Amino acid sequence: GDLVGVNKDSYLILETLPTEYDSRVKAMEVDERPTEQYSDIGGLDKQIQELVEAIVLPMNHKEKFENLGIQPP
Amino acid sequence: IRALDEGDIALLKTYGQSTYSRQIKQVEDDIQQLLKKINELTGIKESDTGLAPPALWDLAADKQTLQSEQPLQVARCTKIINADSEDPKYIINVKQFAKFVVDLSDQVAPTDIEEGMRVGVDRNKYQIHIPLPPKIDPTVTMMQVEEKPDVTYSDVGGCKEQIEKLREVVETPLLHPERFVNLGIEPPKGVLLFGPPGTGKTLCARAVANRTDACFIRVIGSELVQKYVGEGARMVRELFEMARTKKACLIFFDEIDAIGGARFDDGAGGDNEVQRTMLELINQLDGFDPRGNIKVLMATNRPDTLDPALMRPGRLDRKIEFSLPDLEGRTHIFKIHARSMSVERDIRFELLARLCPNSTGAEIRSVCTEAGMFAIRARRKIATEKDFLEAVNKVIKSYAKRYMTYN
Amino acid sequence: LQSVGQIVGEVLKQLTEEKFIVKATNGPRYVVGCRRQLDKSKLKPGTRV
Amino acid sequence: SKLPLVTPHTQCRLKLLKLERIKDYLLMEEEFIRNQKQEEERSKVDDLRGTPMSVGTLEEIIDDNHAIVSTSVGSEHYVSILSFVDKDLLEPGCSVLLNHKVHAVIGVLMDDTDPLVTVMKVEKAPQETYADIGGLDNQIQEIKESVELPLTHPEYYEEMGIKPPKGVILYGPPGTGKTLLAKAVANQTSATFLRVVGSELIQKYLGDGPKLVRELFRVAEEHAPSIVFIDEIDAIGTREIQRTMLELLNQLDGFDSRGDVKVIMATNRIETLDPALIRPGRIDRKIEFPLPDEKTKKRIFQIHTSRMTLADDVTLDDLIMAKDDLSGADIKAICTEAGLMALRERRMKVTNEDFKKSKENVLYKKQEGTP
Ligand SMILES: Nc1ncnc2c1ncn2[C@@H]1O[C@H](COP(=O)(O)OP(=O)(O)O)[C@@H](O)[C@H]1O
Ligand SMILES: Nc1ncnc2c1ncn2[C@@H]1O[C@H](COP(=O)(O)OP(=O)(O)O)[C@@H](O)[C@H]1O
């Protein structure tokens, strides 16, 4: 299940290729990187903290979770 | 009674004839056979081709280009390998044919080629040389109006506040961005139009499209509702991409009640697919990624029926009500409709307006037309107040149209 | 680089000791033969060749 | 083209004389045709389009002479357009002839797709005329004023500044001649006739209803002067079906400018019609088709029995009399069954008693129920 470039007539593999998922799938990823600050959200501070501790903290550290032994959400 | 024995039909069709029968049926068979002989003799009719006027075309340039250029195939680009950026290599997809690894031509440049991008390619080496525009679905691109309707805001009667508030959003920021930017305000980007049928909502949409000066796309409920799943959502994706291509654009949904129906689940899944399409729309209007300079107009006869997320401000910021016209509005629309006709100068229109019950503007145009037919059926070249009163009577009594349940 | 690929395909009824029916992948089926030296008893309907 | 209409129907030598006149003319056609250049233009163009030429579909036009074309294998090709191709005749979805070797666009092919609506284009109105209908004079003037006069003479309305009426509903008990009147007006003004029967626009597929009505209006406006007939609108008229209603209502009233296509909609249950579809703005002409009265019934009897051989004793008045109990279709049924009854007893000349027992038996089969 690998992507390889072969000879157009003799079909001999003469290149390996990076796996291509789909054009749409490549469209889904974010490249513009929007700029809305957390301070721009008002009143939702508790929910913001919930989402941050659920998502960002597993990204940044992974040590405070493993030191406990928890599976991050 | 015994059935018709062969002798009985024989005598039936023999004794009862005139002394002409044989001649005229034989002559009719000759009609048919001579027609067929004429048809076979003239041959079939030439169906022909294009072939614009003869003096217009050809030149040896045609054949020279035919024998000199290349019939490029079209391929989806993908995954610029960019292994060393001195020769990047690309992947191409020839639909239902193959997938290739290729390079650019001596003409095109790496900056000219992006991922996807729907490039063109030669037919035997499959080297890439042409920048082609992306595939817009034809049933989405014909949706662009391409022709302004012959209606202006002056043709809309009575709804001064409605037209003012709608022009504040769909026309003013495009015409005068300076007012908003120098005051530092963000204008609304979504206007919903609601009211009873025949009050002029589609007329206001026509006026906006005539005065828009930007890219205006009409949208109808039937267009979005495909049969196959996700296809309507796909078309709305392409429609919003098309709107993004234009430097600002106006999107009009007529009778969004066709798709915006509130989500329900317990009906064995319900319509669902229409809900999925309106969900893709509800995301496109405001989801991830800013919408852009896309101002959007919806008109519907059932404002309450649409899903609450669609009513939500930020996607539908300003909601406008077209109620049944008042007496002044009825007079104004009667004037507007009577502008085009050949009528008496002394038609006291406000009388006709106060004879009118709670009649929509469609009723006003209908009664004006009925006066037109009264005048024409009378062959008179001037419509008179008597014609207008008969038209009022006809229209009103027709709309009114045992009934012993009354009092 | 001089090597040339070979078309894969499943086989079908053998008509004789030499001629077989092979269903070349998703493509059409052909009447072909064993080269000279391969087995003959092992080639039964359903052998990838 | 078609033959002239010979208008004696009794077997008389006038009918003969008209016939042999027609035979004379067709025989001159035969004579003339039997009693029997641009090689430069052909040698350039029809040799540039070297045979054979493939048939494909045009998707987009990019440059003045460059366009994208797909073919039946599904591949996509950016090809050039030779100058002789009429650009204005080219649009997305158009069938295009292509050079076999280099796929270059070499001309537009007249459309042969969209089969179903191509069939319902019928255009086969000429079986009837205003002649075939008798006594529906008020209805005739109404529909003439609404749809026929604007097509034949839009000059009156344009001079008056009037935008012509843009919708007609016909209603009444069945067999009163609504379909006949629609076909007759289609015959009087030779504008293309479109007929679609009610429930047939209701479809299992979610899109097929609104899609079908959209394509029918598309083909109607493509034919330009056209009349579209929806009989038994009640089937749709009285979410998905309501969405087809919304599509039809917006195709009538909504965006864009419709132009010249006229709409006739026939219903048997007008009072059950939903308020939306009966638009005062669009549907300003509602034409009732009452059960025929004595004069109208007499006219229908004469029209239908005209082609039948009749005896002297037939007193049409006793057939006409009593009340407005029946319609024109029932009258045709009486005429037909009287013909059969005369045939059984071996009359090729139907008599009064034949019609008497015919009307009696029809009234027997007319309605039912325990006392
Ligand atoms: N206030 C008005 N001024 C002028 N014309 C009007 C007015 N209201 C209605 N009309 C006429 O009646 C028709 C109303 O259609 P409209 O209400 O726009 O359809 P919809 O209800 O589907 O939006 C228009 O074609 C217009 O000519
Ligand atoms: N006024 C009339 N003149 C002649 N024929 C009529 C008349 N009314 C009804 N008919 C007969 O009835 C049939 C048409 O019925 P119609 O009312 O048009 O059907 P529908 O109710 O489906 O519209 C025709 O065959 C026609 O011969």
At which residue do the structure tokens 């089937």 appear?
Answer: D235
How are strands ordered across the β-sheet holding B215-220?
A: B215-220, B249-254, B294-300, B190-194, B318-321
Q: Which of B212, B214, B166 is nearest to B317 (CA)?
A: B166
> Is the previous residue joined to B149 through a cis bond, with omega within 30 degrees of 0?
no
Proximal ligand: closest to the CA of D335: 2
Residue B117: partners with Cβ closer than 8 Å, 6 or more residues away: B77, B131, B132, B134
Q: Which of D162, D248, D253, D255 to mutate to test the pocket of ligand 1 (most atoms within 8 A of CB)?
A: D253
Instruction: State phi, psi for D148 to the nearest 5 degrees.
Output: -80, -45
Ligand 2 site, residue D197, Cβ cutoff 6 A = no
Q: Which of B178, B212, B180 is nearest to B294 (CA)?
A: B212
Could you tell me the CA-to-CA distances from D175 to B145, B350, D181, D229 in Å, in that order?
A: 43, 45, 11, 17
Distance CA B167, CA B183 (A): 18
Distance CA B298, CA B255 (A): 7
Instruction: Tell me the two tokens of residue B185.
Output: 């305000």
For every residue of D238-305, DSSP letters joined together read --HHHHHHHHHHHHHHSSS---S-EEEEEES-GGGS-TTTS-TTT--EEEE-PPP-HHHHHHHHHHHH
Instruction: State phi, psi for B234 to the nearest 5 degrees.
Output: -60, -45
Distance CA B131, CA B113 (A): 7
Searching chain A, which residue's CA lies closest to the CA of residue B80? A18
Distance CA A19, CA A16 (A): 9
Searching chain D, which residue's CA lies closest to the CA of residue B398? D286
How are strands ordered across the β-sheet holding C19-23?
A: C10-14, C19-23, C29-33
| Burial class of residue B58 (count of CB atoms within 10 Å of its CB; 0-12, 13-18, 19+) | middle
DSSP-derived 3-state class of residue B77 = strand
Q: Do B209 and B219 touch, CB atoms closer than 8 A?
A: no
Distance CA D253, CA A30 (A): 43
Ligand 1 site, residue B365, Cβ cutoff 6 A = yes
Show which residues on chain C lie within 8 Å of chain A, measured between beta carbons.
1, 3-5
Q: Do D2 and B6 touch, CB atoms closer than 8 A?
A: no
Distance CA B213, CA A16 (A): 52
Amino acid at site B376: I
To one decimal place, what's the resolution in Å? 3.6
* Nearest-CA residue for atom 6 of ligand 1: B361
Distance CA D38, CA D47 (A): 13
Q: Chain B 302-331, CB below 8 Å of chain D: which residues?
A: none
Whether A18 and B78 lie within 8 Å, measured CB to CB? no
Could you tell me the CA-to-CA distances from D30 to B35, B240, D3, D24, D89 in Å, in that order?
A: 9, 63, 15, 10, 37
Task: Tell me the chain B residues in contact with residue D161 when contact means C-beta distances shorter than 8 Å.
Answer: 340-342, 372
**If phi over 0 gives left and psi between -120 and 50 gives alpha, with beta otherwise, what is residue B271?**
alpha
Instruction: Tell me the two tokens of residue B287.
Output: 């989801």
Where chain A is broken, by preceding residue (C–N > 2.5 Å)? Answer: none
Going by their DSSP bridges, the two strands D285-288 and D262-267 should be labelled as unpaired
Distance CA D349, CA D309 (A): 5
Q: Which residue(s) pair with D193 in the sheet?
A: D227
Q: Do B12 and B3 touch, CB atoms closer than 8 A?
A: no
| Burial class of residue A18 (count of CB atoms within 10 Å of its CB; 0-12, 13-18, 19+) | exposed
Q: Do B158 and B326 touch, CB atoms closer than 8 A?
A: yes
Q: Which of D323, D252, D332 is nearest to D291 (CA)?
A: D323
Q: Considering only the beta carbons, identify the residue of A5, A26, A34 that sits closest to B115.
A: A26
Instruction: Tell me the two tokens of residue A72.
Output: 């991050």
Could you tell me the CA-to-CA distances from D178 to D172, D181, D217, D267 in Å, in that order?
A: 8, 5, 22, 9
Ligand 2 site, residue D332, Cβ cutoff 6 A = yes
Q: Do B99 and B107 touch, CB atoms closer than 8 A?
A: no
Burial code (b: 16+ CB inside 10 Å, e: under 16) for B158-189 equals: bbeebbebbbebbbebbeeeeeeeeeeeebbb
Whether A11 and C3 lie within 8 Å, measured CB to CB? no
Q: How was this structure determined?
A: cryo-EM
Instruction: Tell me the two tokens of residue D363.
Output: 């009234």
Q: Considering only the beta carbons, identify the residue of B79, B100, B290 that sits closest to A18.
A: B79
Ordered alpha helix ranges (H), B43-197: 60-68, 138-141, 160-170, 172-175, 177-182
Q: Do D300 and D182 touch, CB atoms closer than 8 A?
A: no
Q: Provide the angle, in degrees to the nearest 10, between the axes of the packed helices D240-253 and D208-223.
A: 20
Q: What sign results for the dihedral spanned by CA atoms B284, B289, B294, B298? A: positive
Per the annotation, where are the binding residues of D for ATP? Answer: 172-179
Q: What sign results for the dihedral spanned by CA atoms B383, B384, B386, B388? A: positive
Amino acid at site B380: R
Q: Do B261 and B271 touch, CB atoms closer than 8 A?
A: yes
B91 contacts chain A (CB < 8 A): yes
Ligand 2 site, residue D136, Cβ cutoff 6 A = yes
Distance CA D243, CA D250 (A): 10
Ligand 1 atom with the shortest distance to the CA of B155:
4
Instruction: Tell me the two tokens of residue B170.
Output: 């769909």
Question: 10 Å Cβ neighbour count for B250?
Answer: 25
Q: Provide the angle, in degrees to the nearest 10, between the axes of the packed helices B201-211 and B160-170.
A: 40
Q: How close, in Å, is residue B341 to chain D by CA atoms?
A: 4
Q: In this structure, what is the dihedral angle of CA atoms A13, A16, A22, A28, given to the nearest 10 degrees? A: -170
**SS3 annotation, chain C:** CCCCCCCCCEEEEECCCCEEEEECCCCCEEEEECCCCCCCCCCCCCCEC
